[PDB]
């Protein structure tokens, strides 16, 4: 049965390979440390938004493989929507508030490593701003944005889904009506808003899209992207289904 | 060590 | 309460990216990418020690306790010889895509430790150890240290330890020499191996200092009271 002479032959076989920092003399260590930074961010911003996401009345009731599946095509749309907030609420003028202590200026997005990506990032920023969306429809907005993804396949608890759905699309109306009145029905108002959230399946087609055409660009990379490879995992139908306010 | 599915699982239930 | 209301209540806080401009971008990236390393280091010298053989049959708890006593004794003098084999013993040589040059090394924030990551280095150069003795030593390392109040299984610990004791005098013969000159090259890495006790001491010192979570979980499960340090030469 196979075999070896000597002791030291076998410490010679068992010594592992050698293991790469990562570490590209190409990228400077500011896009490094910034991309780094927004990744692990990116990390827990995710586990939060699933905290969240089964705080939510009606969602939580769904089967748990729905909870998944809604989670896994929505995280993006969700974090992108919460940043678009965060970043018209910390402005008056185009930044984008990643973080209080993580805060891009428009000079800093101009960047090349930053442009592609921060168009689509402010672009829900200055919407939220032409509205002038309050809290209560941002709430409102950002729930429907969890379940607005859905696999054709069905969800398992489709009926308790479409009536959480329903409900959810309510609470939008009483919102704007806190905002407006009632003496109105708030018709545009429900059509900008809706909209807006439509628009979110297009910046966050765009955030994938690139993703995909940066992961390619990086041949022989030294410092592997499985971060930017990770999100192509979770996010590659077609099962997904967009649910329109808007055709 | 954790790829997104499986952190959108392990937030899920306990990390 | 009204939907909005619970809404409203279950929104998380909003997160920070841990960020801090007192930090140059030079130091964070260096910094960042060495913890990440040598995480990945860490858990690959665990799977190496599982395959040592001997230490394998040790009791299971006993191989964990050997890892615990030794994992920077033998990431430091792996490192060293890296650094040995890639720059003659004068740049370290963390990774392959890795290398911080003598000017980095000289700055403050990285002075103290690399000082006795270079001895390392140094010193396996200046005794031109080759591989088999440098793979015998290494293995010796997993095996410096042992709870005072002993390990489970000890006398075969001791027989194995032993063996390699004897494999490194094999490496030693390998280069052929005399019977003096053999003497003097045993006693020579014997007192290399020795000498990792406090290039380790002092590299864990400045670790404690970053004390007063990946590398945090281990630094407080380590505060070298019941851990004896097994020595060549006295
Ligand atoms: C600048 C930039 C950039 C990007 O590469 C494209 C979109 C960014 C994404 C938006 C949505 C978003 C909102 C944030 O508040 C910070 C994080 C964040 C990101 C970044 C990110 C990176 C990795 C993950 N993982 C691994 C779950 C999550 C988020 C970085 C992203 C993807
Ligand atoms: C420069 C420098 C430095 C240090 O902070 C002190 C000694 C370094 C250690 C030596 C031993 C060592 C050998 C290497 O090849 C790379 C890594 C390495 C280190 C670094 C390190 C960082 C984190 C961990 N964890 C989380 C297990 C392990 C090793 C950096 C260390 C600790």
Redesign the pocket.
Known sequence: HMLTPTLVSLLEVIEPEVLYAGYDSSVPDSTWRI?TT??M???R??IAAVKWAKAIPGFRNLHLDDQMTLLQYSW?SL??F??GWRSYRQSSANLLC??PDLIINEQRMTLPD?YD??KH?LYVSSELHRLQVSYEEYLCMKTLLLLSSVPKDGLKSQALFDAIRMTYIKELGKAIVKREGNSSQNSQRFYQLTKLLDSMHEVVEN?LN??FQTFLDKTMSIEFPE??A??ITNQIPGNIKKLLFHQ | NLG?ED?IRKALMGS
Do not use: S
């Open positions: 991309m927004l990744n961010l990116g990390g911003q995710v993006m974090m992108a919460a940043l990643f973080a930053m990506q921060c990032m955030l690139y993703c971060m930017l990770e999100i | 997104l952190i």
